[PDB]
Design a protein around this ligand. Structure first.
Ligand SMILES: Nc1ncnc2c1ncn2[C@@H]1O[C@H](COP(=O)(O)OP(=O)(O)OP(=O)(O)O)[C@@H](O)[C@H]1O
Ligand SMILES: Nc1ncnc2c1ncn2[C@@H]1O[C@H](COP(=O)(O)OP(=O)(O)OP(=O)(O)O)[C@@H](O)[C@H]1O
Ligand SMILES: Nc1ncnc2c1ncn2[C@@H]1O[C@H](COP(=O)(O)OP(=O)(O)OP(=O)(O)O)[C@@H](O)[C@H]1O
Ligand SMILES: Nc1ncnc2c1ncn2[C@@H]1O[C@H](COP(=O)(O)OP(=O)(O)OP(=O)(O)O)[C@@H](O)[C@H]1O
Ligand SMILES: [Mg+2]
Lengths: 320, 147, 170, 303, 302, 299, 270
């Protein structure tokens, strides 16, 4: 029952097993900030260098980072006609510019990969994952991002995305960010247990932001989690999600996509475009099972049983 | 036999604790590279199949043998040399190296003499491993590590 | 070397209030799951139903109980019926279909008493039903428009509830 | 909750019947075992037969005939593998049933009587199995019918208690096994317990003394091998010289080598000779000679 | 809900009776055991004999005679298989009954006392069995009768607690036996406990010390083999020269081998001789010689 | 519902009584065991006496005295079979009753504490046993002795794998009663006798104030015993010497006779060999001992 | 969850801690290692200044010592004097670093542990000078809760250490022992410990110094195979028996005490 596991029990679990410690998170941000400052200085010495800016784009900049963070996400804006159009060569171009940008790193420490270029530190630091953005001077750093899922160019503004998130964190001081981590932690466990389960982190943040805009209370983690789960099952991800932070709702018009969660920066860009019906069923089944568990824990007669229900949502690391 | 009773504490990769622990360990730098290489090739052999298509499209038999390899790596050595610390934390380096999530199942054989218990603990460990590994089949969505 | 071992078992326990609360707890879960998708039954009502089910399961008076929505004298999905049985398999609550047409149906509960309830003297019922939350009107049994699916069984020490879910025809 | 017949006793066999009669008569070289076994079993059904014999031949020996009847009706079939212990034990009731003009029911004891680990469970399962044996015979006690209790996996149930590698419940299961045998002898019931073992030495000394007769099964000699091969090689176009060659080769080739068993000849040699010819060739003398020389007899126990 | 007598106690045997009498007389070589058992059981029902014996011979010492009576009434019969432990234990109450002009009832403890597996059942069943024995013996308390409690497979019911493989319940049952024997002894009830075992060494050391006497049984010697064969071979037409070769062959053929038991001769050897002649021939010395040479005694525990 | 008193406590004994002091007198070679056990029990029932002793000889040494007084009220008698463990414990209360001039009641624990196997029954039966013992002691002036005749069955080690959870719980309830008597100042003491000291739980073993070991008698002990017991049998001193020799280890590895072996086996066998026709003979008494072998011992 | 209910409270440097540290006998080697290991854990800056003064060029040696998880495990027999060391060790460390230290002992459940750690980190963050948490005596979630609280203190650059007193090392959780920076073992009492143990208890028994010396010898390891008297044996068996043998008709005598010890046999090792 709720005496055995309450909101506090979920909050303390998030610090111990879900959240990334603040001391580790600030240290991770300092690796990126050093690379950013090196880019500013080199750009000052050479105004014609293509790499005009580097911006942190990931969860660490969002304040939604998980204890299981793979690496630091930063976006570098490429300028000038020299940049090749193909995906393979644009990455190589970026890596070559990056090596020239950082003389102290070895050439082999900068490694192009499928949809990004990675800078790996020598000793005990996380690799920095750099997504190339094609920039032509548009306001608010809008450009052509490289999609990490398929490599297609997406026209959006990462600094505006960050403002969107921070507006919701200002709407719910600490809770909105905490519910995003709890949902992302659940999704990561679900990805390994359920085949055809796919759920994007940015997307989870967009769905939770809509519920926060709708008046859902985030002060209670079990209640807010159940609302996020009850939305997914009730809606079945067939209801389009659109935000009027930067454009009217009318501007989207009609799209044939099965799942429609629209970039609040660009009405043409649909975050859920790669989601299929087989993906959608797997999300709903997990959202159904997750909601059954949290409700079963509310009526559970003993703490031993109440913990076991929560372990269906958060895995073995939850001990209550 | 319950999963909790069998497998002690399950370790989920990547994670900053094992990443930091693995960096701290010293004297096993040559082993770190090999073990991370060998494990990465066994749990994620998909890269070889794209490699094989460009170079040797006709050779189906050859790529099958790499997919069918018995995925056993043995750590034999004098106790206290730091190989248990390596075995437990090596999986975090393989997760980041392969960009995939990994769960680690640790079994302690020395921790009764009852007949059939050896077979009970060993077979049940492989059954939970194969259950978890089958859900990740397709690139694989993840990997499983039985220690 | 190696060895074998023998074991002893404790005396089989009489069905108790804890056992009754273990099964009734899973029922209240299914009613709350149903409320989340169909707005009924109420939180305060769920407790009264759970507390009634404990009294009746502990007394052995119960045979069958049904909760859900009905049009006229016919249950419609969602509708959950639990049947007392002697026999062990215990399952987690849930598996409630959402999005079904509630239409002009309303929530209703119907309960069928066991053979033991019918034989017991009425003075005896009152001592066993001393702690009941509310009195219950009788003898208006509904039907089932759709077919019946047995999806879950909850089992205590001695006794079990076999649940069937009403499935609308498509 | 009394254990049921099926859990304790597998599936009973009834006599007389066509199948057991056919199998018993196919046994080669067990003639002295059949007569011995039918004498003991026939004397339990009808005691008068031996009493009449005493009068005609030894009238003065009044105590002697009483000793034959009062023994515990236990016989032990022991010897080499594939020698006919299980086949003779199963079918022997048939020849007894037809000669004594009665119907015989054979209860084959199940290995479920060992239990699944509860304290005392084996002792109560083994005990209850003898109770059923005694119930069935108590109704039958000239005898209206006879009951046979078969224990083909006998070394697993009765193991010498001196062995260190066994539970206390294993030793109590031997004692329960003993007392059940004593219990059948104390009453007049027409029931006989037959048990077969691959290793006679593994059996408990307290069990072995209660054995009214111990029958030793061995691998076939030249005569028994000749009759057995000649009977089943008929119709395969194999001449007298060839069957004689096969009889030589299916024997011990050294003091160390054990020689062919009964089952090795019937259930290995002959079908392998057929399978080599099957399905596009007839049985050839040269094929049969190749098949015998490939094949080796089953290794024997060290004891 | 107490357990029933039939659930714990097999079939009761009553004395005096003509069968136990006739069975006891058939036994060969046990005359010293019969005498010691009659002395122990006779003093149990009637303690006066030793007190009258004291006056005539050792009047000044009554501690010593009091010592004979106050000890626990447990007698253990142990030895080789088929040597008369069980026959003597069952029929000895008959001889005592006639000599003391008393009725005696024998209670055979069943192996059902171990139970079906629930905790405390063995301790409950064993203790219950003693309560029945104590209650019946209390009614007969010179006592107007005696009660004999027989435990035919001692090693299963009483095992040394040092053995690791047994369960905690098994050691708890051994303790229930210990307290039962002490319980009968503390009261003056005319009840005795007799237990037979093939394996004395398996029995618990606290069981052994409480035994008033331990009687050892062995396989028959050359003389004992002669008396047993000569009585059994009456009417078989075998002269004394043939039976002499049977006595030699029923003896140990190897310095380390055991030789025939009592059971070997009466229940195996002589039956096999008869049956080979049966049904078409008389017993032949040539045949009697052949069945014996083929036969081997039953092996022994090491 | 509370179990009955007789359900748990067998037959209660009171001291001073004539039978106990005579049974205690018959013991031979336990004089060292008697004194320590009588002193410990006397201090456990009456702590005022050691204060008087301190003033006479060592009035300053308060801390020394406290180590004795503050020990738990548990004494375990363990050793070989037939060594006088059970005899000494049942009758030692009389010697404590007479020295302290108070009457004492002995509560012997039955095997009914194991019970019928209902869950929680063990815990309740053993707890109720300590409750009754405390009840009687709390009202006391008098002394209450709790005796466990077979401790190895009632409080076996919980580490051992072949035992139920109800079984371990009864051991746990047993630990709690000893502590529960110890906290309070009640005039109560717990005696338990076990053949096997290694079978007892380690938590019990550390709790016992003292462990007294009982062994098989030595040359001097057997001699003293044999004289008192063989009195008036017309056996000369030269004969009893040979009986002392024969009732010892006949091999370095063999154990030798226990006390019970001499008093309940050898002596009746000597007399029964003469009974009823002849007097006790040196020749016969020497022939019975040579046949007889001592009781075996645990590994 | 109240600070009063969780722990007594002792501030270092205080005079009582210093004087009890002088009382401790036979633990001098433990006192140094426990002070220096605790000193480096709370104040990393302290060793670095020593390093640059004596071996500034060297960095590899200090870096192993610099980074260790902040748990110290004190393991010994019951009444081994290990508890007395931990209560006063904070004072010794204080004088080394010349900074104020505050100690929180702990009673002897998940919720009780978490607050103790949370209270410890709260105070320890603000001081930035250290804070000593002592769990004086030592379900799975509580074990986890203790593991988690150590991890928090180790991640953050916190001057805080955890002292844990356990009677035996066999059953310590493997995750717990990996986190302990140092494991201290307290063996059976040495000559220095056994004397002061016996000298206080034998006070007023009329036993001269020569006698108590011979008792120290007899309660000793003897052959390297033999273990020698434990603390429990002397205080709970030896000294009681000495009094019991004299009671009630005689005083204790040097001869009587000698006979008790020679007959007494020390308890075997594991
Ligand atoms: N489909 C998309 N369209 C537009 N922008 C995207 C899209 N996917 C990702 N982004 C940008 O990438 C950033 C990172 O989001 P992503 O999906 O990589 O999650 P994340 O922050 O890396 O979380 P984690 O690192 O914990 O997985 C977002 O701030 C967003 O601006
Ligand atoms: N004397 C025989 N004559 C002919 N065939 C025999 C003989 N003995 C055994 N066989 C063959 O062996 C087969 C099985 O024999 P059986 O099972 O009796 O051997 P067993 O070793 O006594 O069995 P088990 O090993 O189960 O006790 C029979 O079907 C039969 O074909
Ligand atoms: N001393 C004896 N004299 C004559 N016949 C004996 C003697 N001992 C045993 N026998 C014969 O052996 C048979 C079996 O002996 P019994 O079963 O009574 O004792 P036991 O074999 O020692 O007991 P257990 O069944 O424990 O081995 C008896 O029926 C009897 O005919
Ligand atoms: N030291 C002794 N002096 C005189 N008689 C003794 C002695 N030891 C034992 N006995 C005699 O042996 C008998 C049994 O001893 P008792 O049962 O008291 O101890 P125990 O054998 O340790 O108990 P348990 O039954 O637990 O073995 C007593 O009746 C007593 O007369
Ligand atoms: Mg990221």
């Amino acid at each position: 029952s709720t005496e055995h596991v309450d909101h506090k029990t979920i909050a303390r679990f998030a610090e111990d097993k879900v959240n990334l410690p603040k001391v580790k998170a600030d240290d991770f941000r300092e690796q990126a900030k050093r690379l950013q400052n090196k880019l500013e200085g080199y750009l000052s010495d050479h105004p014609d260098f293509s790499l005009k800016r580097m911006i942190p784009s990931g969860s660490l900049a969002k304040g939604t980072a998980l204890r299981s963070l793979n690496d630091i996400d930063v976006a570098v804006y490429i300028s000038g006609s020299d940049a090749p159009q193909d995906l393979r060569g644009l990455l190589d171009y970026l890596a070559d510019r990056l090596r020239k940008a950082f003389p102290n790193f070895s050439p082999d420490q900068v490694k192009p990969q499928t949809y990004s270029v990675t800078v790996s530190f020598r000793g005990s630091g996380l690799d920095v994952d750099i997504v190339p953005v094609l920039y032509s001077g548009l306001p608010d750093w809008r450009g052509h991002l490289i999609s990490q899922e398929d490599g297609s160019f997406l026209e959006t503004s990462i600094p505006l995305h960050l403002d969107f998130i921070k507006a919701r964190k200002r709407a719910a001081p600490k809770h909105f960010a905490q519910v995003v981590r709890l949902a992302k932690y659940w999704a990561r466990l679900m990805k390994q247990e359920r085949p055809n389960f796919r759920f994007k982190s940015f997307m989870i943040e967009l769905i939770l932001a809509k519920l926060l805009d709708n008046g859902v209370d985030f002060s209670n983690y079990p209640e807010a989690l159940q609302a996020f789960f009850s939305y997914l099952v009730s809606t079945e991800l067939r209801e389009r999600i659109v935000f009027e932070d930067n454009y009217p709702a009318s501007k989207i018009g009609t799209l044939s996509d099965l799942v429609q969660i629209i970039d609040p920066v660009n009405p043409v860009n649909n975050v859920a475009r790669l989601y299929t019906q087989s993906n959608v069923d797997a999300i709903i089944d997990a959202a159904m099972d997750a909601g059954d568990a949290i409700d079963a824990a509310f009526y559970a007669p003993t703490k031993q049983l109440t913990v076991t229900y929560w372990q269906k949502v958060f895995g073995s690391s939850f001990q209550g | 036999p319950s999963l909790d009773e069998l497998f002690e504490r399950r370790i989920n990769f990547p994670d900053f604790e094992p990443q930091e622990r693995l960096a701290r360990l010293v004297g096993l730098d040559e082993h770190k590279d090999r073990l991370s290489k060998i494990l990465g090739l066994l749990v994620n052999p998909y890269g070889i199949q794209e490699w094989a298509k460009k170079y040797h499209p006709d050779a189906r038999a050859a790529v099958d043998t790499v997919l069918r390899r018995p995925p056993l790596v043995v750590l034999a050595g004098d106790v206290g040399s730091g190989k248990t610390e390596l075995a437990e934390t090596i999986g975090d380096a393989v997760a980041r190296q392969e960009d995939i999530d990994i769960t680690l199942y640790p079994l302690s054989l020395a921790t009764q003499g009852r007949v059939g218990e050896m077979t009970q603990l060993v077979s049940a460990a492989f059954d939970y491993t194969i259950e978890a590994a089958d859900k990740l089949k397709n690139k694989a969505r993840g990997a499983v590590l039985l220690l | 070397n190696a060895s074998s071992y023998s074991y002893t078992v404790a005396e089989t326990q009489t069905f108790s209030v804890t056992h009754a609360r273990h099964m009734a707890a899973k029922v209240a879960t299914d009613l709350r799951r149903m409320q989340r998708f169909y707005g009924y039954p109420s939180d305060a009502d769920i407790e009264a139903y759970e507390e009634e089910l404990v009294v009746f399961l502990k007394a052995g008076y119960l045979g069958e109980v049904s909760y859900g929505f009905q049009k006229n004298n016919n249950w419609i999905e969602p509708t959950l019926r639990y049947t007392a049985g002697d026999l062990g398999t215990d399952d987690d609550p849930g598996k409630i279909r959402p999005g079904k047409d509630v239409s002009g149906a309303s929530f209703y509960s119907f309960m069928t008493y066991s053979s033991k309830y019918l034989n017991a003297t009425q003075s005896e019922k009152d001592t066993a039903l001393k702690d009941l939350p509310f009195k219950r009107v009788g003898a208006q049994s509904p039907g089932i428009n759709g077919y019946l699916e047995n999806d879950k069984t909850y089992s205590a020490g001695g006794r079990s509830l076999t649940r069937t879910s009403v499935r609308n025809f498509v | 909750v009394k254990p049921s017949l099926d859990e304790l006793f597998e599936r009973r066999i009834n006599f007389p019947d066509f199948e057991p009669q056919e199998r018993l008569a196919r046994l080669v070289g067990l003639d002295e075992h059949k007569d011995r076994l039918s004498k003991i079993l026939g004397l339990l059904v009808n005691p008068y037969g031996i009493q009449e014999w005493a009068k005609k031949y030894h009238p003065d020996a009044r105590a002697a005939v009483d000793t034959v009847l009062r023994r515990p009706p236990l016989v032990v079939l022991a010897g080499d593998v594939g020698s006919g212990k299980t086949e003779l034990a199963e079918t022997i009731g048939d020849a007894v049933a037809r000669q004594e003009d009665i119907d015989i029911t054979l209860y084959p004891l199940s290995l479920a009587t060992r239990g699944q680990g509860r304290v005392g469970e084996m002792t109560q399962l083994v005990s209850a199995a003898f109770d059923y044996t005694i119930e069935a015979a108590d109704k039958l006690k000239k005898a209206r019918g006879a009951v046979l209790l078969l224990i083909d996996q006998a070394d697993a149930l009765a193991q010498s208690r001196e062995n260190a590698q066994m539970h206390h419940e294993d030793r109590a299961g031997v004692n329960a096994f003993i007392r059940g045998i004593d219990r059948i002898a104390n009453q007049k019931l027409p029931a006989a317990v037959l048990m077969c073992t691959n290793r006679l030495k593994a059996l408990d000394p307290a069990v072995q003394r209660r054995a009214a007769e111990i029958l030793t099964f061995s691998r076939p000699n030249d005569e028994q091998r000749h009759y057995l091969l000649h009977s089943k090689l008929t119709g395969l176009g194999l001449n007298s010289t060839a069957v004689e060659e096969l009889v030589r080769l299916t024997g011990p080739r050294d003091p160390n080598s054990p020689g062919f068993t009964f089952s090795d000849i019937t259930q290995r040699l002959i079908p392998s000779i057929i399978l080599a010819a099957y399905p596009y060739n007839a049985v050839s003398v040269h094929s049969a000679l190749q098949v015998v020389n490939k094949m080796t007899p089953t290794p024997a126990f060290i004891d």
